[PDB]
């Protein structure tokens, strides 16, 4: 049905000749190249590169028409079919290309970027339709879910819709730690903006994330057990213990990422947020105790707890009492740890104090320096 596409361009060509922008000879050249592309798309063996080439060709024709309008007509916009004809046509090629090749994420991305650029011409509702259709074809690609989540939180700032995106995406892909990470990142961004707006309100006059964290920890554990086991359960007790250990280390690294995430957000009470994570690991999980089965992971937990109170204290505002509390915590854990663990926990704590505080303090002017050096010597 290549010819039917050819008449649809006739009204545009007649408008171009009528406005004088393009001569009949030149317009004939345009029609000849469009004819070749239309044959290429409708023939067998057609590929996405053919659609990209035709879209690129039409874009150049749009540029040439625009400049000839100012050059010859001397008008920004001539009220005729020629103005929106190319832009409408280019969208049609995208629709045909995406439908023909739903696999290619590359063409979908160009489709969305092309229309988001022309926000005035293309309503945001149509953008939702494309994201809707794309999500249905690829529900398991977390990148798409975040893309519409990001677009509707930045361009439109509709937090309600963006939450539904994350809720729907996590429903389809609860085993992807990345999607949970971004959803928490979105959750903290909303609180930080909300509190900043509250601060602005006064001038001119969060636990919810932790719940997302907790469920992320459980669901990721389940799927990691579902994987590494296949269809059947593992009969041997020792292997089942190894699978439990794999989840703990896998989850512990994931939880460690959320600890790193908390540091970015200054407004929130990071110590309170981190303490909840520490409390989560203090609970026995999968019948394995961190102190007994994974001392190396336990040591990192102890180190964070010991340095929790002094983690965010700047060198200028260092409180001796808070430092004493940190040391008091450090001594308490030694009495319950083995000799090898104590040496490892020891060396780490000395480096932490030396790098963060001792190296950044002037030895001659700060009286706290001698106390830090004495504490470092005694530890």
């Amino acid at each position: 049905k290549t010819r039917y596409y050819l008449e649809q361009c006739i009204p545009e060509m007649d408008d171009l000749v009528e406005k004088g922008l393009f001569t009949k000879n030149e317009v004939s050249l345009i029609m000849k190249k469009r004819t070749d592309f239309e044959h290429r798309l409708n023939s067998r063996g057609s590929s996405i590169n053919d659609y990209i080439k035709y879209i690129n060709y039409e874009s150049n024709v749009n540029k040439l028409r625009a400049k000839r309008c100012k050059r010859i007509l001397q008008v920004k916009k001539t009220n005729s079919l020629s103005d929106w004809s190319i832009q409408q046509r280019i969208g049609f090629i995208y629709q045909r290309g995406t439908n023909k090749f739903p696999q290619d994420l590359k063409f979908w991305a160009m489709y969305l970027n092309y229309m988001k650029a022309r926000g005035n011409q293309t309503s945001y509702k149509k953008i939702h339709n494309i994201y809707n259709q794309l999500l249905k074809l690829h529900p398991t690609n977390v990148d798409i879910w975040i893309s519409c989540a990001k677009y509707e939180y930045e361009v439109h700032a509709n937090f309600k819709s963006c939450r539904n995106i994350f809720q729907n995406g996590l429903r389809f892909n609860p085993d992807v730690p990345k999607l949970w990470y971004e959803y928490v990142k979105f959750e903290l961004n909303f609180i930080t903006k909300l509190i900043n707006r509250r601060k602005v309100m006064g001038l001119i006059n969060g636990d919810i994330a932790l719940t997302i964290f907790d469920v992320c920890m459980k669901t990721l554990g389940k799927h990691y057990i579902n994987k590494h086991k296949g269809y059947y359960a593992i009969s041997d007790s020792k292997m089942n213990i190894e699978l439990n250990k794999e989840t703990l280390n896998y989850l512990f690294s994931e939880s460690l990422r959320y600890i790193k995430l908390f540091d970015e957000f200054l407004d929130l009470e990071r110590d309170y947020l981190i303490n909840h994570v520490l409390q989560f690991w203090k609970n026995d999980m999968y019948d394995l105790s961190l102190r007994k089965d994974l001392p190396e992971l336990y040591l990192k937990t102890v180190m964070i707890d010991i340095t929790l109170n002094i983690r965010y204290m700047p060198v200028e505002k260092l409180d001796i009492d808070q430092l004493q509390l940190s040391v008091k915590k450090y001594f308490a854990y030694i009495s319950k740890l083995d000799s090898a663990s104590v040496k490892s926990l020891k060396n780490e704590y000395r480096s932490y104090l030396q790098d963060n505080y001792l190296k950044k303090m002037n030895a001659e002017d700060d009286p706290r320096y001698k106390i830090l050096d004495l504490i470092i010597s005694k530890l």
Binding site: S147, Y153, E182
Partner: peptide
């Protein structure tokens, strides 16, 4: 929120013969 999607844009049954 980081998404690569935008960055992505730019014979067995034969007997022997005697």
């Amino acid at each position: 929120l980081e998404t690569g999607f935008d960055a992505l844009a730019n014979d067995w049954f034969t007997l022997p013969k005697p």
